[PDB]
C-alpha cells in the first residue's frame, strides 16, 4: 500500500502551518489522509481543470437542483460516499444523519471508516 | 426442391439436404435424408443411383442443377422408416481407384488429361496450369495423384487449382468464381480467429536432388521471429524452384473466419472468392443445409494460409 504523509493546511486560516524553523509542518499518513478528504469534499467535480474526473464532489451543484428533501439527502449521501471512497485508505463511509434545523437550511453528519479500522481474525495452523 | 434420381421426383419425401464441401475434400458431398414409406420403398433406391438436385439459383433465379452425382451409400432405419443417403459427385470414384503411372517432366494439365484419357473420364477444356513438374512415379489414388501434382504446381509459383466434377471433369482455379458475394449483409454470426499455429517465417531448403541447391529465404524474421521450416523434397531440383517453393510457403499463421449465414447462397463452393466486410477471402469450406429454412455456414481464409496448409 505504502501511503505517505503530507504537510498540514489549517483550513480555518487557509495557510500552511510552519514550524519556527520556517519549514512546513509535516504530518503523519492519517493526518494527510484527513486533510485530503476535507480538500476533496471542498473541491467541486469536473470544474477545476487540474484534476481528473475522479477527484472532487458535486455538492454545490445539488443546491440549485429541484429534487425533494429526502431525494437531496440520498444525493448528498451518494456524493460524499463516492467522493471519499476513491482514496485507497478508505474502507467504508456511512452512518449518515440529517437535521433540517430551519425550514430549508440543513446540517448533516457522516462517519468515515479507515482500512486500519478493520478487525482481523486470529488463527494459524 | 427437385430431386430427380433416375426417373422419379423424391423431393416429396426429403426432410432435409446438406450440401457440404472442403477445399481438400474428396468430392462435393450431398447428404439428403428421406422418409421411406411404401411409395418410396417401391422404387428401391440402391447405391450407385444418380441424384440430380435442382433448385432456384441465387444468381439469375432460374432452376439450375446445383448438384449432379451418384448415391455412394444408403442407410435405412426400420423402426422409423427414414432412409438416409450420402451422395457424392464422381470424383469419389477417382479417390478409390488406385493405379501406378510413371511420368516424365511435364505440366499438371497434361497429366490430368492423360488420367482422364486412360480412365475414360469426360472433361471440359482444362486450364493450362503452366507450371512444369519434375519426373515422378505415383501409386496413390487418381485423385491423390491429381492433388499431388496440383500441390507441386502451387509450388513453383503456379496458381492454385482444384478439381471438381459436375457432369464432366473441370479444373477450377480458386480465385475465379463469377460473383464475389458479400456475406456481411446476412451475417448471423462470425468467428474471426487469428494465430501463429502454422506460421512460416523462414525455410531452409536442403535439396535431395542436384540442379547442391541449399539456401534460406527468411521473409519476416524481424517481426514474428524466425519460425523456420525445412523443405527437403526431391521434386525441387532447381534454384528458382527452391525460391518459388519458399515464397509459396510464408504466411502469418492461421487466419480464418468461421462465418454463419442466415441465408443460403446456393452457388457457393469450395475455393470460391467471397467477401466479408471490405476484405476478400477464399472459401476453405462450405456447408449448406437446405432444411425448411435455407441456411449456410462457411469457413474462409486468406490465400497465404491456404497455400501454406493445403498446398
Amino acid at each position: 500500500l505504502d501511503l505517505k504523509g503530507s504537510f498540514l493546511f489549517d483550513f480555518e486560516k487557509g495557510e500552511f502551518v510552519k514550524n519556527a524553523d520556517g519549514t512546513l509542518k509535516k504530518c503523519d499518513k492519517v493526518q494527510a489522509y484527513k486533510q485530503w478528504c476535507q480538500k476533496a469534499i471542498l473541491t467541486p467535480r469536473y470544474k477545476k481543470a487540474a484534476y481528473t474526473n475522479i477527484y472532487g464532489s458535486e455538492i454545490k451543484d445539488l443546491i440549485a437542483s429541484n429534487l425533494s428533501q429526502s431525494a437531496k439527502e440520498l444525493e448528498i449521501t451518494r456524493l460524499i460516499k463516492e467522493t471519499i471512497l476513491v482514496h485507497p485508505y478508505t474502507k467504508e463511509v456511512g452512518e449518515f444523519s440529517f437535521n433540517w434545523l430551519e425550514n430549508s437550511r440543513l446540517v448533516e453528519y457522516e462517519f468515515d471508516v479507515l482500512t486500519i479500522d478493520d478487525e482481523n481474525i486470529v488463527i494459524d495452523g | 426442391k427437385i430431386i430427380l434420381n433416375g426417373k422419379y421426383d423424391i423431393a416429396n419425401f426429403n426432410e432435409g439436404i446438406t450440401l457440404s464441401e472442403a477445399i481438400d475434400g474428396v468430392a462435393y458431398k450431398m447428404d439428403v435424408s428421406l422418409v421411406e414409406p411404401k411409395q418410396l420403398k417401391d422404387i428401391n433406391i440402391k447405391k450407385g443411383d444418380k441424384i440430380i438436385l435442382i433448385d432456384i439459383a441465387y444468381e439469375s433465379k432460374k432452376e439450375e442443377t446445383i448438384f449432379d452425382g451418384v448415391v455412394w451409400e444408403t442407410r435405412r432405419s426400420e423402426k422409423s422408416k427414414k432412409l438416409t443417403l450420402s451422395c457424392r459427385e464422381r470424383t469419389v470414384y477417382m479417390e478409390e481407384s488406385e493405379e501406378q503411372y510413371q511420368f516424365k517432366e511435364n505440366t499438371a494439365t497434361q497429366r490430368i488429361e492423360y488420367y482422364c484419357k486412360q480412365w475414360n473420364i469426360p472433361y471440359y477444356n482444362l486450364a493450362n496450369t503452366g507450371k512444369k513438374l519434375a519426373k515422378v512415379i505415383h501409386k496413390t489414388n487418381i485423385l491423390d495423384m491429381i492433388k499431388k501434382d496440383l500441390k507441386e504446381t502451387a509450388t513453383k509459383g503456379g496458381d492454385l487449382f482444384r478439381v471438381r466434377m459436375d457432369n464432366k471433369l473441370k479444373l477450377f482455379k480458386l480465385g475465379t468464381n463469377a460473383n464475389v458475394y458479400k456475406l456481411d449483409s446476412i451475417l448471423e454470426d462470425a468467428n474471426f480467429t487469428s494465430s501463429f499455429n502454422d506460421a512460416v517465417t523462414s525455410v531452409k531448403v536442403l535439396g535431395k536432388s542436384k540442379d547442391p541447391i541449399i539456401g534460406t529465404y527468411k521473409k519476416d524474421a524481424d517481426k514474428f521471429g524466425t519460425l523456420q521450416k525445412i523443405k527437403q523434397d526431391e521434386k525441387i531440383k532447381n534454384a528458382k524452384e527452391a525460391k518459388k517453393a519458399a515464397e509459396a510457403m510464408f504466411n502469418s499463421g492461421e487466419e480464418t473466419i468461421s462465418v454463419d449465414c442466415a441465408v443460403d447462397i446456393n452457388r457457393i463452393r469450395a475455393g470460391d472468392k467471397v467477401s466479408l466486410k471490405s476484405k476478400e477471402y477464399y472459401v476453405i469450406d462450405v456447408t449448406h443445409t437446405l432444411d425448411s429454412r435455407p441456411k449456410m455456414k462457411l469457413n474462409i481464409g486468406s490465400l497465404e494460409y491456404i497455400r501454406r496448409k493445403f498446398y
Binding site: 474526473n53 475522479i54 429526502s70 431525494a71 444525493e75 463516492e82 471512497l85 482514496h87 | -
Partner: protein
Amino acid sequence: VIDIYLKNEKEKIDFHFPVNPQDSLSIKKEKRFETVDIVNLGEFDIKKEGEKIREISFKTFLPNKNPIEVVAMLEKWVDQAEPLRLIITGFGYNGLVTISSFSNTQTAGREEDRDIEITFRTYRELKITDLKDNRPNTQTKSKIYTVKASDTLYKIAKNLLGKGSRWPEIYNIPENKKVIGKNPNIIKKGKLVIPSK
C-alpha cells in the same frame, strides 16, 4: 413521502413518476457462493468475490405529459446504452440502473390511462499507489461547443474530451479546420467547434 426520479443523462431529461409504485417495492440481495462437497466431509460453502446484478421491479399507472408520450419516452430509454439514475426517496435507493423490460397496458375502462409494469437492473461500468477509479463517469455535454473568450483548444479538449492532449482529434475534423484558423493555437470566441463522437 415516496417519489421515484429517473435522471437520464445522454438525453438531459429528469423524469419524475406521477404515481407511486402501487402495492409494494422490493429488493433482493444474494451473496455469490457455490457449494463444494469434499469426500468424507460433505458440503461446504465458498464465497465468490464479486457482486450480483439485482433488480428492482414494480408497476404504476400513468394518469391523464400525456401517458402516450411518457410511454414512448421510456420505450426509447429502454434501448439506451448509457445508464439511468434511479432515486427512490422513502425506500432509500439511489444508484445507476438500466431498464430490462417495460410494458404498457390499456384497460376496458380508464382508456386514457396506461398501466405500467417496469423493471430495472443495477448498472456497473467496465473500465480498462493511486486513487481508485470507482466514480461513475455519467456526465454529458453537447456534441457542438461554442468557444468562450478564455478558452484554448487544449482547455476545450480537457473539459470536453478527457485527457486534454486529445485536441488534435478536435482540430483534424475538416469542419473544425475550416472554422478554426490554420494555427491551432489561435482561436476566437463564438465560433462553433465539434468534439469527436
